[PDB]
Design a protein around this ligand. Structure first.
Ligand SMILES: CC(=O)SCCNC(=O)CCNC(=O)[C@H](O)C(C)(C)COP(=O)(O)OP(=O)(O)OC[C@H]1O[C@@H](n2cnc3c(N)ncnc32)[C@H](O)[C@@H]1OP(=O)(O)O
Ligand SMILES: CC(=O)SCCNC(=O)CCNC(=O)[C@H](O)C(C)(C)COP(=O)(O)OP(=O)(O)OC[C@H]1O[C@@H](n2cnc3c(N)ncnc32)[C@H](O)[C@@H]1OP(=O)(O)O
Ligand SMILES: O=S(=O)(O)CCCN1CCN(CCO)CC1
Ligand SMILES: O=S(=O)(O)CCCN1CCN(CCO)CC1
Ligand SMILES: N[C@@H]1[C@@H](O)[C@@H](O)[C@@H](CO)O[C@@H]1O
Ligand SMILES: N[C@@H]1[C@@H](O)[C@@H](O)[C@@H](CO)O[C@@H]1O
Lengths: 316, 316
């Protein structure tokens, strides 16, 4: 057996699906979109028996800015790691993560994260990969809290419009709103979400995927919505193969801090969901939510669907 | 609004699917099979606005034996409770569970369990119903550990036959094995699993659904396997609508205590899965497993799929 770099995307995806495809079905389009467009220092290391790929790890160091966050070179990420089912418990996973980690460490990493990278596949260790928690524990990762993808079928429920206090308008974005939108993000969400707006517009997000809420003329919040016409495969629709015809998604969503807790997030969410409904969306997902916010979406009939555990290793 | 009994099965199932059908798709056949065949003292209470059902609770007291376990009349169960999404946070759930609980209590119940009943729909509080944990907490239930349904696609992986030490044979059950099987269960699994064998044979389980392992002539273990021809809808195939064509399942599985930890459970599991594979099964589920045993199935590529929290209220 040898460990060496591979960018044999088909073989990786094939191995991915054979091992975990029932619950994280992967396709080449998503795999390539996410791997190729990422701007971090990144690598894929494979484990090989001769010419046969038997496992891999994808890993990154935070070397590229997130909006007005500077990169923190101390942070590295394990995007994914899978050893083929017929080669488990032979130390291969170990050798792969050793190689990843030693490299990150030599280049200055001191905090190693399970998922949560830019162009992530996973917010953390999936519950479906719960037994890997012990693999990570043994290597010095500590297990922390959970995030959840939520699922709902917006074709099945009708909801009541929240009561519009006046001045506030919710609308699908137009090209000429881009200036205002960026101005709002620099103020309120100037980190990764800003960076995602910039990068997603570059990779095929369209104005139709964005809903804005304005007070008078000022942008004071947004959502990103997805359907089966969206060009960019974002996190809500990663696992669209599980979601049927007329799939969709939503996230992220935010309101200017000074307008919070007046029912405006609820209004934006309502309107975003009506747009999706009108687009004939059925099952749809809201990705990477925290526990404390689940009820916000649950009023609209969304339920936790997948769970992911945050996990972090501090380099000694 | 009024609370009163309802056996309007279609309306219940309709409400069930509108609220939680994306993740627990219910059909009338399963609902009726499970509700009607249960032998416990049982009731369904509905909440109504005039003629419209807006919520329900199904509840039971342990009044019927489990194999050679006597019923423990102190145990009651909340099989399920759902309030329609357009009527939440109006106290309806409260009034329903108050009515259920007061009745159980008057009839002698002192321990109240979330799911885990005979003919259960849920081993505990589903993770997809995680926000209800707080509903139950407020009423004095304590949250305990987790159980997991596991999922795998047996069409996608080939496995190695474990090394047969001699004497042990694994075979699909025949009618004439029924005596031996019961003899083995009275010895080794004489509680609910024995009772399930008796009752499932009465409701349409066939010898083809059972695999036995024998040493010489003695039955020393079993599994129950399911495919799309099984007549009895058991727990592994409750959520078959999520599982595609050629769905299947497995569970329970057991080995005589004196033969444990010699590789025989692994051999039985291997053979059971080969049978399913030969029956062209693809996605299949292993229901209600504990954390400590997940790896046993994970060697065969099964992964946690759903999680359920045990929860118990001790009556003051
Ligand atoms: C950010 C993310 O990628 S999260 C998702 C992680 N990936 C997955 O869950 C995919 C499916 N699983 C796998 O691919 C594998 O099981 C991996 C990658 C987790 C581990 O790969 P392997 O090559 O089997 O691990 P390796 O043989 O080095 O195991 C090292 C040690 O970790 C621990 N370990 C590994 N797997 C397990 C397990 N399933 N349960 C408990 N401990 C485990 C053990 O201590 C093991 O030593 P042992 O064999 O002496 O018991
Ligand atoms: C064994 C099993 O059946 S497990 C599955 C349980 N069922 C479900 O999860 C199905 C979907 N959910 C539902 O049907 C409902 O949300 C139910 C049945 C859990 C609760 O019904 P409701 O009629 O909304 O509850 P009710 O209004 O009596 O709530 C009472 C209190 O419980 C607590 N509570 C209820 N729902 C929630 C929630 N989603 N989050 C936090 N606390 C809650 C609150 O303290 C609430 O009081 P409040 O309204 O003053 O905050
Ligand atoms: O990164 S931004 O400053 O642009 C905004 C970040 C805000 N969200 C980050 C992720 N958490 C937790 C994930 O649900 C919620 C807040
Ligand atoms: O009830 S029997 O005596 O027939 C056998 C019970 C054995 N199993 C019961 C449920 N637990 C935990 C559920 O996974 C495993 C043991
Ligand atoms: N839900 C979003 C998720 O999509 C992602 O942008 C992430 C970034 O931290 O956190 C958010 O809350
Ligand atoms: N997996 C089984 C489950 O099907 C059920 O029979 C239950 C009874 O307690 O526990 C078992 O471990």
């Amino acid at each position: 057996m040898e460990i060496k770099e591979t960018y044999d995307f088909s073989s990786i995806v094939d191995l991915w699906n054979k091992n975990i495809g029932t619950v994280y079905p992967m396709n080449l389009e998503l795999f390539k979109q996410n791997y190729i467009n990422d701007r971090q220092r990144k690598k894929i290391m494979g484990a090989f028996n001769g010419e046969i790929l038997i496992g891999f790890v994808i890993y990154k160091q935070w070397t590229y800015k997130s909006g007005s966050l500077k990169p923190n070179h101390k942070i590295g990420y394990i995007n994914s790691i899978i050893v083929d089912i017929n080669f488990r418990h032979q130390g291969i996973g170990t050798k792969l993560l050793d190689a990843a980690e030693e490299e990150l460490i030599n280049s200055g990493v001191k905090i190693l994260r399970c998922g949560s990278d830019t162009y992530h596949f996973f917010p953390g260790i999936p519950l479906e990969c719960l037994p890997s928690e012990e693999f990570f524990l043994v290597r010095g990762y500590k297990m922390q809290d959970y995030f959840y993808d939520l699922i709902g079928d917006v074709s099945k429920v009708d909801f009541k419009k929240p009561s519009i206090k006046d001045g506030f308008k919710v609308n699908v974005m137009k090209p000429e709103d881009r200036k205002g939108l960026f101005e709002f993000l620099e103020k309120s969400f100037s980190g990764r979400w800003l960076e995602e707006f910039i990068e997603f517009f570059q990779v095929g997000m369209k104005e139709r995927d964005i809903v804005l809420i304005k007070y008078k003329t000022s942008v004071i919040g947004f959502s990103h919505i997805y359907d089966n016409k969206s060009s960019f495969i974002g996190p809500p629709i990663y696992w669209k193969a599980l979601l049927g015809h007329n799939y969709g998604g939503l996230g992220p969503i935010g309101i200017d801090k000074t307008y919070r807790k007046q029912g405006l997030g609820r209004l934006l969410l309502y309107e975003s969901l009506q747009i999706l409904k009108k687009r004939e969306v059925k099952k749809m997902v809201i990705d990477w939510t925290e526990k404390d916010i689940i009820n916000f979406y649950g009023r609209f009939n969304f339920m936790p669907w997948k769970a992911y555990r945050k996990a972090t290793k501090e380099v000694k």
